[PDB]
Structures are given as C-alpha cells and as structure tokens.
Design an enzyme around this catalytic site. Sequence first.
Site, PDB file in Angstrom:
ATOM      1  N   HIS A  10       4.078   2.394   4.878  1.00 49.86           N
ATOM      2  CA  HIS A  10       5.048   2.754   5.899  1.00 49.86           C
ATOM      3  C   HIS A  10       6.030   3.866   5.575  1.00 49.86           C
ATOM      4  CE1 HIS A  10       4.433  -0.868   8.589  1.00 49.86           C
ATOM      5  NE2 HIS A  10       4.362  -1.514   7.459  1.00 49.86           N
ATOM      6  N   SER A  41      -0.241  -4.592   5.965  1.00 51.05           N
ATOM      7  CA  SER A  41      -0.138  -5.933   5.460  1.00 51.05           C
ATOM      8  C   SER A  41       0.635  -6.882   6.362  1.00 51.05           C
ATOM      9  CB  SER A  41       0.506  -5.898   4.127  1.00 51.05           C
ATOM     10  OG  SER A  41      -0.471  -5.479   3.207  1.00 51.05           O
ATOM     11  N   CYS A  42       1.481  -6.355   7.256  1.00 47.53           N
ATOM     12  CA  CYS A  42       2.287  -7.126   8.216  1.00 47.53           C
ATOM     13  C   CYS A  42       1.460  -7.908   9.242  1.00 47.53           C
ATOM     14  CB  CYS A  42       3.212  -6.202   9.017  1.00 47.53           C
ATOM     15  SG  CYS A  42       4.017  -4.986   7.947  1.00 47.53           S
TER      16      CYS A  42
HETATM   17  C1  LIG Z   1       2.270 -10.232   3.949  1.00 50.51           C
HETATM   18  C2  LIG Z   1       3.339  -9.233   4.286  1.00 50.51           C
HETATM   19  C3  LIG Z   1       3.953  -9.276   5.538  1.00 50.51           C
HETATM   20  C4  LIG Z   1       4.963  -8.364   5.874  1.00 50.51           C
HETATM   21  N1  LIG Z   1       5.416  -8.399   7.141  1.00 50.51           N
HETATM   22  C5  LIG Z   1       6.394  -7.552   7.509  1.00 50.51           C
HETATM   23  C6  LIG Z   1       6.845  -7.581   8.893  1.00 50.51           C
HETATM   24  O1  LIG Z   1       6.304  -8.224   9.807  1.00 50.51           O
HETATM   25  N2  LIG Z   1       7.947  -6.779   9.170  1.00 50.51           N
HETATM   26  C7  LIG Z   1       8.431  -5.867   8.241  1.00 50.51           C
HETATM   27  O2  LIG Z   1       9.273  -5.055   8.651  1.00 50.51           O
HETATM   28  N3  LIG Z   1       7.998  -5.820   6.980  1.00 50.51           N
HETATM   29  C8  LIG Z   1       7.010  -6.652   6.581  1.00 50.51           C
HETATM   30  N4  LIG Z   1       6.522  -6.603   5.286  1.00 50.51           N
HETATM   31  C9  LIG Z   1       7.059  -5.622   4.341  1.00 50.51           C
HETATM   32  C10 LIG Z   1       6.472  -4.228   4.525  1.00 50.51           C
HETATM   33  O3  LIG Z   1       5.048  -4.317   4.511  1.00 50.51           O
HETATM   34  C11 LIG Z   1       6.964  -3.294   3.408  1.00 50.51           C
HETATM   35  O4  LIG Z   1       8.383  -3.303   3.463  1.00 50.51           O
HETATM   36  C12 LIG Z   1       6.497  -1.835   3.495  1.00 50.51           C
HETATM   37  O5  LIG Z   1       5.082  -1.775   3.502  1.00 50.51           O
HETATM   38  C13 LIG Z   1       6.908  -1.021   2.273  1.00 50.51           C
HETATM   39  O6  LIG Z   1       6.567   0.444   2.448  1.00 50.51           O
HETATM   40  P1  LIG Z   1       6.411   1.308   1.245  1.00 50.51           P
HETATM   41  O7  LIG Z   1       5.813   2.551   1.693  1.00 50.51           O
HETATM   42  O8  LIG Z   1       7.750   1.380   0.604  1.00 50.51           O
HETATM   43  O9  LIG Z   1       5.523   0.535   0.214  1.00 50.51           O
HETATM   44  P2  LIG Z   1       4.080  -0.218   0.076  1.00 50.51           P
HETATM   45  O10 LIG Z   1       3.649  -0.884   1.309  1.00 50.51           O
HETATM   46  O11 LIG Z   1       4.114  -1.011  -1.151  1.00 50.51           O
HETATM   47  O12 LIG Z   1       3.070   0.876  -0.108  1.00 50.51           O
HETATM   48  C14 LIG Z   1       2.912   1.634  -1.403  1.00 50.51           C
HETATM   49  C15 LIG Z   1       1.697   2.500  -1.139  1.00 50.51           C
HETATM   50  O13 LIG Z   1       1.680   3.669  -1.976  1.00 50.51           O
HETATM   51  C16 LIG Z   1       0.487   3.657  -2.803  1.00 50.51           C
HETATM   52  N5  LIG Z   1       0.730   4.142  -4.203  1.00 50.51           N
HETATM   53  C17 LIG Z   1       1.525   3.551  -5.177  1.00 50.51           C
HETATM   54  N6  LIG Z   1       1.559   4.213  -6.314  1.00 50.51           N
HETATM   55  C18 LIG Z   1       0.749   5.330  -6.121  1.00 50.51           C
HETATM   56  C19 LIG Z   1       0.412   6.394  -6.964  1.00 50.51           C
HETATM   57  N7  LIG Z   1       1.090   6.595  -8.097  1.00 50.51           N
HETATM   58  N8  LIG Z   1      -0.489   7.273  -6.525  1.00 50.51           N
HETATM   59  C20 LIG Z   1      -0.872   7.175  -5.253  1.00 50.51           C
HETATM   60  N9  LIG Z   1      -0.637   6.216  -4.352  1.00 50.51           N
HETATM   61  C21 LIG Z   1       0.213   5.273  -4.806  1.00 50.51           C
HETATM   62  C22 LIG Z   1       0.094   2.165  -2.822  1.00 50.51           C
HETATM   63  O14 LIG Z   1      -1.312   2.027  -3.143  1.00 50.51           O
HETATM   64  C23 LIG Z   1       0.388   1.717  -1.371  1.00 50.51           C
HETATM   65  O15 LIG Z   1      -0.621   2.241  -0.503  1.00 50.51           O
HETATM   66  C24 LIG Z   1       5.458  -7.424   4.910  1.00 50.51           C
HETATM   67  C25 LIG Z   1       4.807  -7.358   3.660  1.00 50.51           C
HETATM   68  C26 LIG Z   1       3.766  -8.241   3.334  1.00 50.51           C
HETATM   69  C27 LIG Z   1       3.126  -8.188   1.949  1.00 50.51           C
END
Ligand SMILES: Cc1cc2nc3c(=O)[nH]c(=O)nc-3n(C[C@H](O)[C@H](O)[C@H](O)COP(=O)(O)OP(=O)(O)OC[C@H]3O[C@@H](n4cnc5c(N)ncnc54)[C@H](O)[C@@H]3O)c2cc1C
Length: 447
Positions: A10, A41-42
Amino acid sequence: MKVIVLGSSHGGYEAVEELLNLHPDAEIQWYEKGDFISFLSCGMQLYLEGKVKDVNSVRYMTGEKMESRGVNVFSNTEITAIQPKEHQVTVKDLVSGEERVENYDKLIISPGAVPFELDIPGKDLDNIYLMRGRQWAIKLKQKTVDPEVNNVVVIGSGYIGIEAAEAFAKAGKKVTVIDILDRPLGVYLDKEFTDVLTEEMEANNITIATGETVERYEGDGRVQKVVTDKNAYDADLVVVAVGVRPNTAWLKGTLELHPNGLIKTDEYMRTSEPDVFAVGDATLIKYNPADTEVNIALATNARKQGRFAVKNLEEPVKPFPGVQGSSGLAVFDYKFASTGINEVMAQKLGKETKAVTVVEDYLMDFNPDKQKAWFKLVYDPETTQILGAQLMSKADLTANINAISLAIQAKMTIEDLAYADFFFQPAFDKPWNIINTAALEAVKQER
Ligand SMILES: Cc1cc2nc3c(=O)[nH]c(=O)nc-3n(C[C@H](O)[C@H](O)[C@H](O)COP(=O)(O)OP(=O)(O)OC[C@H]3O[C@@H](n4cnc5c(N)ncnc54)[C@H](O)[C@@H]3O)c2cc1C
Ligand SMILES: NC(=O)c1ccc[n+]([C@@H]2O[C@H](COP(=O)([O-])OP(=O)(O)OC[C@H]3O[C@@H](n4cnc5c(N)ncnc54)[C@H](O)[C@@H]3O)[C@@H](O)[C@H]2O)c1
C-alpha cells in the site's frame, strides 16, 4: 528525473500513483522482491471464509497494468542495499542471481513489516503458521478443509488473531485464542465492547484464554501442544498473530532508525538521508488525538504517507495533516469501529480522559427493525474536546465513526456534537442520532 519506489504494497503503490499524476514525465522504477504485485492481505478474511474463491483476484494492481502506464516493474527483484551518498541501490534478481547497481534521483521506500514470532522452544515444528501475504493465505485456506485439523490455537487476540479465530470457527474447528492482555481486542476497544464480543465468540465455541504466557510448543515433527504458564492446549494448527516488526534490519547503519527498528522520518516523509523518503508500516505517523507520533500500522496511513512523500519530493512543501487511528471490523454479527483514544491508548500516552457510554436502540420504539447500539465518546476533561469514539451494533452504523474522526481533527467539543446537524428520518435513526445522544450525555455530566 528517475524515481525508484521500493515495495508494491500500500505505501509503494500510492507513491507510484501520485508520481504518475504529479510527475508524468519521470522515469519510474517499481521494485517487489515477491512474486505477486499488490496482493491485498486485508482481503484474507473474505477469501478464507469463501466469500472470494480466487486468491489471485484479491489484489489492486498488476505489473502489466502499471507497465501500460510507463512504469518499469521489477518483481522477484530485491533491493539489497542503499548507498544514500552516491544515490545508488544495489538490486538482486532473485530468479537469476544477478546483482546490479541502479542509480536514482529520488528513492521512496515502503519496506513494510514482517510477522513477529515468539522465539520459544518448539519455534518451528510444522503447522505453526503466520498470516500475511499470498502464500500464508493459500496455506491457511488449505487447512480450513483438512479433516485432520481439529484444534486450532491462535496466539494473539488483536485484529489478525480474531480474523483467524472467526474463519477457523466457521469452518468447523475448535479454536482457542491466547493473549497476555486481559480482554480480546483490548487494543482497539474498551471493556464494555469486548465483554459483548467475548460472549459472541464463546457462543461460536472459541475459547478465550487471556492473561497467559506461551512458553513452548510441543510435538513430534509437527506441533501438538501449546503450553503456557497456566495450561496446555492441544493444537493441530497454531496461527501466530502477535503483531508486526519493521522490515528494516538491512538498513541499520544506512539510515537512522529508532531503537525499535522503525525508520526516523519527519512530516514531509524525509529520512535522515537526502533524497530518500520512507512511508508505511516501517514509520511513525502524526497522531492528532495526542499531538504525538505513533506507529499505526494501517493501510490507510501508508497510502496517505506514500502520496505525501511524492508531494515533498523536490521541496518540503506540504506537511502531513495527521491521522486519528481509525479502524473497523465485523466479528460474527457485530460491526464495530473506533477512532482516537481509547483506554489502552490513553494509558500508553499518559493522557487523562473522560467518557460516556450509551447503549440503546438506535431506532425509535415503534419501529420493529430496531436493534441495540453501543457508543462511547471519549473527551478531554479540561477542554471537553473530542479525543475518540467507539461504536458497535449488529446493524452497520460504522460510517458514523468518520464524522468523529473529523471532529477530533477539527478540535470540536462535546457541545459542538450535542447540537451538530445530523439528519433524521425514522427508518434510519432517532431525532437525536447516535453521536448527538452520547454528546448530550457528556454535556449533562459536565454540567
Ligand atoms: C491479515 C491482515 C489484515 C489487514 N487488514 C487491514 C484492513 O482491513 N485495514 C487496514 O487499513 N489495514 C489492514 N492491514 C494492515 C495493512 O495491510 C498494512 O498496514 C499495509 O499493507 C502496510 O503497507 P506497507 O507498504 O507499509 O507494507 P507491507 O504491506 O508490509 O508491504 C511491504 C512490501 O514491500 C516489499 N519489500 C520489502 N523489502 C523489499 C526489498 N528490500 N526489496 C524489494 N521489495 C521489498 C515486500 O515484499 C512487500 O511487498 C492488514 C494486514 C494483515 C496482515
Ligand atoms: N481491521 C483492520 O483495520 C485491520 C485488520 C488486521 C490487521 N490490521 C493491522 O495490522 C497490524 C498487525 O495485526 P495483529 O493482529 O498482528 O496485531 P495487533 O496489534 O492488532 O494485535 C497483536 C495482539 O498480540 C497480542 N500479544 C502480543 N504479544 C503476545 C504474546 N507474546 N503472547 C500473546 N499475546 C500477545 C497483543 O496483546 C495484541 O492483542 C496491526 O497494526 C493491525 O491494526 C488492521
């Protein structure tokens, strides 16, 4: 201008969107070490209960779609390291093993979080599962129909824990949920809401084992027992949903990190190093109820942060407006939502608060469709400003939490809400609706 975005979840996805409408001209590279671009994953709960049949449709973007737009997508490509001074990242192609150094003008990273594991004896016997991403979604789905799985233990009763607990209970297994805290969902809701949800869960034969510390997993080859300080529970499957730790250890020494591993950033999403911004679960966010920065690992936060990092790409021009921590969920028949400060947040931050709870039918007496609603309004004892609210009903009244989130952000008071103009029609609400009624009660209590 060449911009490299790390992550297709996200935060990295919205940074690419805002780069497309603010710098259409730019050369954008989007990296994802995983195999699947933008799995949501949500939506894991909808899939596990069978509402969604296709796991690959639980997503919001594809690499092919972004490439039609001129973005270069690199899946199965990991960013191994950042060299902030020479404005370079070293990337490794995970299918061929080929490393290469890529140069950038601006780097936005959204590295995310990883499931925290209990590191105890038994740590990984088979069938101790985590819940994040495609692969754990598929594996958890397979266990839902496995006739050999009868007892499921989930460790952690926060949002992911209670979603694994409801999906396995609905599939027919016996579920025990274990937490060190004393109330399921205590992080999000107060005692008057979680007493009703404990009943509902126990009615669907979920056993809540609160106030217990897991010490070891026992079993031969695969897990068979989860033993806590007070008890041993038979388990054919354990889902560990004990929270999330930031995916930043590879950045130690490269960017400044807080003691807990979160990246240091300011209100323009800038890290300690020039030209690299950080967004998402790996960062702290401005939390308006208490005018401080807090880690609030939610998708909405990461999406907003990802766009604000592009807004401040060239000049710190647009400070982040802050968030109130709003979240919602349905557990069996109950639909609830909270925003701002509840009891556990006020304890953590050392904030003293006052609250009124109103439990009554949300429709007038003669209307046969009437049902109970619970509404709790938390306010500041000195200013009487709104600090948070929690609501629950079997009817969906959750869009109302959105009006409270704006009232916290605009610093309104219980008196403002007591007489704020919310429509009446007797098929939808009472003449003083759910927000008006709780605020009127707070006004009387402060009279
Ligand atoms: C079961 C579940 C249900 C959820 N439900 C909700 C909901 O309904 N409402 C809500 O608001 N939030 C919800 N959340 C939380 C939400 O999914 C997260 O807050 C959000 O996805 C985080 O975004 P992000 O980009 O910070 O990180 P992440 O989702 O952790 O994504 C990190 C991404 O970057 C990639 N990456 C990492 N390191 C590297 C690297 N060095 N090289 C290249 N690629 C890399 C990873 O592979 C992954 O694709 C939920 C989470 C889960 C697990
Ligand atoms: N509806 C939603 O918006 C939604 C749904 C799921 C996840 N998310 C977010 O994703 C993140 C991760 O979710 P989560 O459910 O993993 O975490 P969470 O913080 O919601 O809850 C973790 C739970 O684990 C418990 N716990 C911690 N250590 C423990 C231990 N050693 N033994 C037993 N209990 C322990 C905590 O007390 C807490 O109750 C959170 O930020 C969550 O809010 C939100």
